[PDB]
Amino acid sequence: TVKELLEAGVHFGHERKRWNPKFARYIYAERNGIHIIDLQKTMEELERTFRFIEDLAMRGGTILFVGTKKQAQDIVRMEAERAGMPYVNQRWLGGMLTNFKTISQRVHRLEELEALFASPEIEERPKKEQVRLKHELERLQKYLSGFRLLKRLPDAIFVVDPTKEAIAVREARKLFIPVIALADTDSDPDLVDYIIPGNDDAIRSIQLILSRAVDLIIQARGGVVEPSPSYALVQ
RNA sequence: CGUCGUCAGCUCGUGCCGUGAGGUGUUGGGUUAAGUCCCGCAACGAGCGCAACCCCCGCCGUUAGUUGCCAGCGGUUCGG
Ligand SMILES: [K+]
Ligand SMILES: [K+]
Ligand SMILES: [Mg+2]
Ligand SMILES: [Mg+2]
Ligand SMILES: [Mg+2]
Ligand SMILES: [Mg+2]
Ligand SMILES: [Mg+2]
Ligand SMILES: [Mg+2]
Ligand SMILES: [Mg+2]
Ligand SMILES: [Mg+2]
Ligand SMILES: [Mg+2]
Ligand SMILES: [Mg+2]
Ligand SMILES: [Mg+2]
Numbered sequence: 344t345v346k347e348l349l350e351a352g353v354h355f356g357h358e359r360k361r362w363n364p365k366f367a368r369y370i371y372a373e374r375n376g377i378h379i380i381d382l383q384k385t386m387e388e389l390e391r392t393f394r395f396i397e398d399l400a401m402r403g404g405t406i407l408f409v410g411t412k413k414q415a416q417d418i419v420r421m422e423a424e425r426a427g428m429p430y431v432n433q434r435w436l437g438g439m440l441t442n443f444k445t446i447s448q449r450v451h452r453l454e455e456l457e458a459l460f461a462s463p464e465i466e467e468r469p470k471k472e473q474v475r476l477k478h479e480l481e482r483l484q485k486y487l488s489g490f491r492l493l494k495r496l497p498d499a500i501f502v503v504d505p506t507k508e509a510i511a512v513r514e515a516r517k518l519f520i521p522v523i524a525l526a527d528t529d530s531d532p533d534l535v536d537y538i539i540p541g542n543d544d545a546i547r548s549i550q551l552i553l554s555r556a557v558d559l560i561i562q563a564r565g566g567v568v569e570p571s572p573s574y575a576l577v578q
Numbered sequence: 579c580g581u582c583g584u585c586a587g588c589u590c591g592u593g594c595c596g597u598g599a600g601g602u603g604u605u606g607g608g609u610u611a612a613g614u615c616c617c618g619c620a621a622c623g624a625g626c627g628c629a630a631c632c633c634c635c636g637c638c639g640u641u642a643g644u645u646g647c648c649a650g651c652g653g654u655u656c657g658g
Contacts, residue, residue, distance in 0.1 A: 437620030442593035445622050452623095471630095510620065514594090 344393075344562075346555055347386065353541040353548040354380045356528040366528050369540040378528045380540050392523060392537040393559055400563035404498035406523070408489070408553075409435060409511045415503040415549045417576050422553040423489055425571065426561050429497070430489030431511070440514040443496055450491050453483040499523055501556070504543040505530045525552055546577060 356362075356370070356378035369388075371381040399406070408430040410419035416432050423430035431439065439446050456476055459465065465473060500515050502508045502524035512534055515522045524535040527543045542548040554571045561568045 434619090436622065438593040438622055440593095442620095442622065445592055449622070510594095514620095517594095 344555065344559065346389075346551060349551070350382070350385065351547065352545050353385070353551065354382060355542050355545065355548075356380055357544075362528040363531055365532055366526070366530065366540075369526075369532065369538070370528065380528075380542075385540050388538050388540060392539055393556070395521070395537050396523070396556060396559055397563045399499055400560045403564075405429065405493065406560070407431065407493065407497040407500040409500060409508045410503040410549075411435060412504045412507050412543060414544060414546060415553075418546070418549050418553055418573055419503065420488070421573055422557045422571060425557050425568065426564070427492060428501075428557075428560065429492035432488055433486050435508055435511050436486065437510060438514075439490065439511070440496065440518055440520070443493075446487075446490070447493075449483070450487055453480070453487055453491060456480040456483065496520070502535075503549060503553075505535055507543075525549065550574070550576070 354371070359373065359376045359378070362378055366378075369381055369384050371379050373379070396406075406428045408419050408423040408428060410416055410430070410432065411434055419430050420432050436446065456479060459476065460480065496518065497520065499521045500511060500523065502512060502522065505512050505522075505524040505526055506529050512522055512524070514520075516534065521536045522534065523537045523539070524530070525539045525541050525543055525548075526532055526535055527541070532538050532540075539552060541552055550573050554573060557571065558568070
């Protein structure tokens with residue numbers, strides 16, 4: 344909530360090419376063939392976006408964090424492992440929202456296999472199944488790590504790169520789900536309901552935005568939490 | 579019942595794409611006897627198949643000696 348001047352490394356966008364003309368309104372200028380985000384409109388949209396986030400959080404809503412860009416995976420896996428908003432980390436499976444019932448059946452199988460490895464039934468039906476179900480539970484935890492927390496459809500989704508996660512965005516549009524996204528110059532802002540015009544490649548931009556967002560979430564429900572332990576992920 | 583053919587296939591449910599017939603999944607890369615498995619993927623699963631569970635042949639044990647052996651000894655018309 345104090346990120347006015349601390350926006351160090353967020354204004355850097357993509358190159359001159361690989362952009363989207365619809366993003367031109369959120370661009371300040373072009374320095375050395377690189378689009379730089381308008382610093383004013385950034386906070387201008389941040390006001391409305393964070394206000395919507397606070398309203399949805401203090402009402403008890405659930406937000407789905409989607410990140411697959413390989414530069415926000417380790418960040419999303421813990422910023423959502425904070426206040427219980429679920430997340431999708433390894434890859435976004437087609438139909439997670441429109442076919443939510445089948446993926447929930449997969450989650451049922453996940454917790455079923457978790458119950459089997461908690462019961463003494465591990466030794467019966469010998470080692471063949473003890474390896475098959477082991478690998479099955481492994482990949483289920485690999486893909487449904489954060490998704491298992493969704494009992495129903497989410498009330499909003501959070502995206503790190505709406506161009507890389509365009510399928511999740513489209514599915515959210517189909518179900519009238521609000522779309523919060525950290526957009527860059529390579530994305531279409533019309534599809535995003537609450538835009539955050541920042542950088543999606545840098546680690547500090549993602550860490551800053553997501554850390555402050557989860558801090559706002561926990562602040563809306565009281566009990567301000569300590570600073571997130573995602574700084575050590577700078578590496 | 580024969581046949582393609584023990585050939586590796588044929589489909590469904592939901593989602594997604596297309597005005598629609600349909601497509602996706604079932605394509606792809608690695609692998610296998612195999613749609614076998616792995617990785618990737620707008621797909622996620624499932625059914626009939628594949629394989630497995632059945633039988634026979636291979637090694638060993640337990641249980642049991644009207645089949646077997648001077649393995650072990652005695653008798654022997656010396657033929658367990
Ligand atoms: K067309
Ligand atoms: K193949
Ligand atoms: Mg065969
Ligand atoms: Mg279909
Ligand atoms: Mg056509
Ligand atoms: Mg249609
Ligand atoms: Mg079909
Ligand atoms: Mg087909
Ligand atoms: Mg095909
Ligand atoms: Mg199969
Ligand atoms: Mg596939
Ligand atoms: Mg007899
Ligand atoms: Mg006998």
